[PDB]
Tab-separated table of C-alpha atoms and ligand atoms in Angstrom:
chain	number	residue	atom	x	y	z
A	1	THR	CA	-23.799	11.842	52.255
A	2	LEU	CA	-23.168	13.459	49.284
A	3	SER	CA	-26.042	15.388	47.047
A	4	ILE	CA	-26.713	17.488	44.391
A	5	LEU	CA	-28.934	20.270	44.529
A	6	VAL	CA	-30.502	22.091	41.788
A	7	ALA	CA	-33.292	23.821	39.903
A	8	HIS	CA	-33.481	23.016	36.143
A	9	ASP	CA	-36.260	23.715	33.824
A	10	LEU	CA	-38.161	21.357	31.266
A	11	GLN	CA	-34.490	21.597	28.608
A	12	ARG	CA	-32.386	21.772	31.918
A	13	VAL	CA	-31.622	25.329	31.727
A	14	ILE	CA	-30.242	26.413	35.261
A	15	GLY	CA	-28.727	29.882	34.848
A	16	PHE	CA	-28.841	32.990	32.722
A	17	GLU	CA	-26.739	35.514	32.750
A	18	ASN	CA	-25.092	34.314	36.252
A	19	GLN	CA	-28.597	34.308	37.405
A	20	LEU	CA	-31.498	32.111	37.863
A	21	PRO	CA	-33.801	32.552	34.881
A	22	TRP	CA	-36.808	32.462	36.970
A	23	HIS	CA	-38.576	33.869	40.394
A	24	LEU	CA	-39.621	31.507	42.266
A	25	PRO	CA	-39.409	32.255	46.316
A	26	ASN	CA	-40.701	28.614	47.376
A	27	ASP	CA	-37.734	27.119	45.485
A	28	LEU	CA	-35.518	29.325	47.681
A	29	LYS	CA	-37.206	28.373	50.712
A	30	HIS	CA	-36.713	24.654	49.677
A	31	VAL	CA	-32.881	25.240	49.185
A	32	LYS	CA	-32.787	26.752	52.652
A	33	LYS	CA	-34.920	24.299	54.321
A	34	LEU	CA	-32.650	21.405	53.060
A	35	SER	CA	-29.319	22.929	53.361
A	36	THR	CA	-29.580	24.454	56.758
A	37	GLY	CA	-26.985	23.030	59.480
A	38	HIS	CA	-25.429	21.525	56.334
A	39	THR	CA	-22.291	22.589	53.308
A	40	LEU	CA	-22.583	23.707	50.438
A	41	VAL	CA	-20.368	23.567	47.559
A	42	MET	CA	-20.656	26.188	45.031
A	43	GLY	CA	-18.240	26.990	41.842
A	44	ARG	CA	-16.913	30.983	41.890
A	45	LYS	CA	-19.160	32.385	39.499
A	46	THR	CA	-21.972	30.970	41.195
A	47	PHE	CA	-20.645	32.120	44.522
A	48	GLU	CA	-20.184	35.545	42.911
A	49	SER	CA	-23.617	35.752	42.151
A	50	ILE	CA	-25.097	35.568	45.838
A	51	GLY	CA	-22.279	37.567	46.493
A	52	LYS	CA	-22.031	36.407	50.099
A	53	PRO	CA	-22.171	33.358	52.283
A	54	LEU	CA	-25.612	31.991	52.933
A	55	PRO	CA	-26.264	31.815	56.761
A	56	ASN	CA	-26.556	29.036	59.239
A	57	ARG	CA	-24.556	26.532	56.782
A	58	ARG	CA	-20.703	25.984	56.038
A	59	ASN	CA	-20.057	27.591	52.732
A	60	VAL	CA	-17.507	26.286	50.496
A	61	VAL	CA	-16.439	27.947	47.477
A	62	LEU	CA	-14.434	25.992	44.661
A	63	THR	CA	-11.711	28.173	42.645
A	64	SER	CA	-8.251	27.933	41.043
A	65	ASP	CA	-7.868	31.839	42.788
A	66	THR	CA	-5.397	31.125	45.570
A	67	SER	CA	-6.163	34.800	46.328
A	68	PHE	CA	-9.927	33.977	47.216
A	69	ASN	CA	-10.138	34.361	51.001
A	70	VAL	CA	-13.796	35.473	51.975
A	71	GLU	CA	-14.882	35.946	55.235
A	72	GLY	CA	-17.343	33.408	56.527
A	73	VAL	CA	-16.080	31.298	53.498
A	74	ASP	CA	-14.003	28.346	53.047
A	75	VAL	CA	-11.944	27.851	49.895
A	76	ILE	CA	-11.276	24.655	48.147
A	77	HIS	CA	-9.622	24.396	45.324
A	78	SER	CA	-9.637	21.093	43.632
A	79	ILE	CA	-12.925	18.336	43.491
A	80	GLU	CA	-10.953	16.132	45.661
A	81	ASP	CA	-11.387	18.435	48.257
A	82	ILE	CA	-14.722	17.912	48.043
A	83	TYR	CA	-14.429	14.119	49.563
A	84	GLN	CA	-12.871	15.534	52.803
A	85	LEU	CA	-16.013	17.705	53.990
A	86	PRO	CA	-17.555	16.187	57.186
A	87	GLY	CA	-21.383	15.680	57.166
A	88	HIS	CA	-24.305	16.277	54.730
A	89	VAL	CA	-22.480	18.161	51.626
A	90	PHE	CA	-25.082	19.751	48.797
A	91	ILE	CA	-23.135	20.188	45.467
A	92	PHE	CA	-24.749	23.748	44.615
A	93	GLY	CA	-23.665	24.395	41.295
A	94	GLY	CA	-22.930	26.161	38.512
A	95	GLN	CA	-23.265	23.764	35.673
A	96	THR	CA	-19.273	23.276	36.032
A	97	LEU	CA	-20.018	21.616	39.279
A	98	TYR	CA	-22.522	19.574	38.235
A	99	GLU	CA	-20.638	18.139	35.183
A	100	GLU	CA	-18.180	17.006	37.240
A	101	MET	CA	-20.206	15.909	40.252
A	102	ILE	CA	-23.009	14.361	38.804
A	103	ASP	CA	-21.896	10.810	38.380
A	104	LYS	CA	-20.440	10.732	42.057
A	105	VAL	CA	-23.147	11.841	44.393
A	106	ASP	CA	-25.615	9.436	46.010
A	107	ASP	CA	-28.807	11.429	45.679
A	108	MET	CA	-29.853	14.601	43.679
A	109	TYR	CA	-32.286	16.922	44.929
A	110	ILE	CA	-33.814	18.329	41.827
A	111	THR	CA	-36.853	20.979	41.514
A	112	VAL	CA	-38.136	20.822	38.092
A	113	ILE	CA	-39.406	23.713	36.847
A	114	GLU	CA	-41.738	23.205	34.550
A	115	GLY	CA	-41.675	26.056	31.826
A	116	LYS	CA	-39.129	26.622	28.972
A	117	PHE	CA	-36.679	29.956	29.752
A	118	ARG	CA	-33.709	31.295	27.899
A	119	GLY	CA	-30.490	29.953	29.336
A	120	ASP	CA	-26.887	29.973	28.796
A	121	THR	CA	-25.879	27.671	31.626
A	122	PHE	CA	-27.790	23.699	31.744
A	123	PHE	CA	-27.934	20.683	33.973
A	124	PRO	CA	-25.988	17.652	32.255
A	125	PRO	CA	-28.838	15.398	30.600
A	126	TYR	CA	-29.445	12.198	33.032
A	127	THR	CA	-31.892	9.552	32.918
A	128	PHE	CA	-34.564	7.728	35.099
A	129	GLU	CA	-33.343	4.416	34.130
A	130	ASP	CA	-30.138	5.447	36.434
A	131	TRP	CA	-32.360	6.900	39.114
A	132	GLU	CA	-34.918	5.976	41.272
A	133	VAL	CA	-37.529	8.472	42.328
A	134	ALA	CA	-37.717	8.475	46.233
A	135	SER	CA	-40.354	11.419	46.488
A	136	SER	CA	-41.906	13.714	43.668
A	137	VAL	CA	-43.906	16.549	45.215
A	138	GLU	CA	-45.501	19.190	43.594
A	139	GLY	CA	-44.798	22.579	44.481
A	140	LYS	CA	-47.699	24.885	45.584
A	141	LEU	CA	-48.684	27.950	43.370
A	142	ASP	CA	-49.672	31.412	44.489
A	143	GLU	CA	-49.227	35.012	44.169
A	144	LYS	CA	-46.077	35.143	44.357
A	145	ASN	CA	-44.976	31.708	43.250
A	146	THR	CA	-46.767	31.318	39.535
A	147	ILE	CA	-44.385	28.922	37.910
A	148	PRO	CA	-45.647	25.124	37.958
A	149	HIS	CA	-42.679	23.047	40.007
A	150	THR	CA	-42.003	19.805	41.313
A	151	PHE	CA	-39.799	18.593	43.780
A	152	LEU	CA	-37.958	15.683	43.282
A	153	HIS	CA	-35.529	13.418	45.553
A	154	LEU	CA	-33.651	11.154	43.340
A	155	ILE	CA	-31.440	8.233	44.302
A	156	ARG	CA	-29.000	6.524	42.107
A	157	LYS	CA	-29.976	3.293	41.412
B	201	NAP	N1	-30.416	26.602	38.684
B	201	NAP	C1	-30.036	26.132	39.943
B	201	NAP	O1	-30.377	25.450	40.966
B	201	NAP	C2	-28.758	26.982	40.026
B	201	NAP	C3	-27.795	27.033	41.732
B	201	NAP	C4	-26.476	27.375	41.424
B	201	NAP	C5	-26.103	27.977	40.385
B	201	NAP	N2	-26.518	28.457	39.027
B	201	NAP	C6	-26.413	28.594	37.731
B	201	NAP	O2	-24.989	28.100	37.299
B	201	NAP	C7	-24.696	29.544	36.836
B	201	NAP	C8	-23.293	29.448	36.737
B	201	NAP	O3	-22.545	28.138	36.231
B	201	NAP	P1	-20.736	28.071	35.929
B	201	NAP	O4	-20.394	27.086	35.239
B	201	NAP	O5	-20.951	29.283	34.718
B	201	NAP	O6	-20.055	28.544	36.718
B	201	NAP	P2	-19.760	27.828	37.889
B	201	NAP	O7	-20.122	26.680	37.992
B	201	NAP	O8	-20.600	28.387	39.226
B	201	NAP	O9	-18.146	28.405	38.955
B	201	NAP	C9	-17.227	27.859	37.902
B	201	NAP	C10	-16.020	28.083	38.224
B	201	NAP	O10	-15.612	27.260	39.444
B	201	NAP	C11	-14.631	27.203	39.836
B	201	NAP	N3	-14.248	25.652	39.507
B	201	NAP	C12	-15.380	24.623	38.784
B	201	NAP	N4	-14.580	23.187	39.005
B	201	NAP	C13	-13.075	23.327	39.010
B	201	NAP	C14	-12.339	22.538	39.542
B	201	NAP	N5	-12.358	21.566	39.038
B	201	NAP	N6	-10.756	23.357	39.867
B	201	NAP	C15	-10.963	24.036	40.397
B	201	NAP	N7	-11.895	25.461	40.325
B	201	NAP	C16	-13.205	24.941	39.447
B	201	NAP	C17	-13.662	27.716	38.733
B	201	NAP	O11	-13.352	28.829	39.348
B	201	NAP	P3	-12.190	29.687	38.815
B	201	NAP	O12	-12.207	30.601	37.471
B	201	NAP	O13	-12.395	31.298	39.880
B	201	NAP	O14	-10.860	29.032	38.803
B	201	NAP	C18	-14.699	28.069	37.163
B	201	NAP	O15	-14.189	29.276	36.574
B	201	NAP	C19	-24.966	30.503	37.108
B	201	NAP	O16	-26.415	30.877	36.038
B	201	NAP	C20	-25.952	30.418	37.981
B	201	NAP	O17	-26.838	31.308	38.151
B	201	NAP	C21	-28.132	27.552	38.808
């Protein structure tokens, strides 16, 4: 299975200055829950913002840099390499990867951040006439999770 994994705001912002525009612990837990034991594919900029591989899952970074060799990280140099990765593969950003993969994935795990943030990177436009809502679940708000958010699982119609 090939899945997009992303959080975007009401205007599809996903990033600002190579970081998430929001602080939302519960979404990071959501990402951790979904991707643990599986594979995360990320563009080079996204990986460098994280800085180290996320524990307990396969970390795959897409880059043109043939000198890239990071302990705990598997490198790939083309989109086509993604299709060789066994198991459940999550496309985990950034903008370039989402743009390259949105027409190819089976489904998408999208956290809609119900706010308007300043962004410099965006998730590409999509329509629900192409995607069925398999589930839609409101995130719980608390002390440390203060922005309304909704967990969507969308499956290509
Ligand atoms: N909101 C979310 O759920 C979420 C999740 C992850 C990331 N993000 C955000 O996304 C933003 C980064 O997005 P971005 O588009 O600027 O960068 P990116 O997608 O993370 O990285 C772009 C780089 O990926 C490599 N790449 C992409 N496609 C390639 C291809 N077909 N062949 C070879 N290399 C390829 C290239 O690396 P080289 O230049 O080294 O060749 C390219 O410069 C950050 O702000 C981050 O916070 C948001």
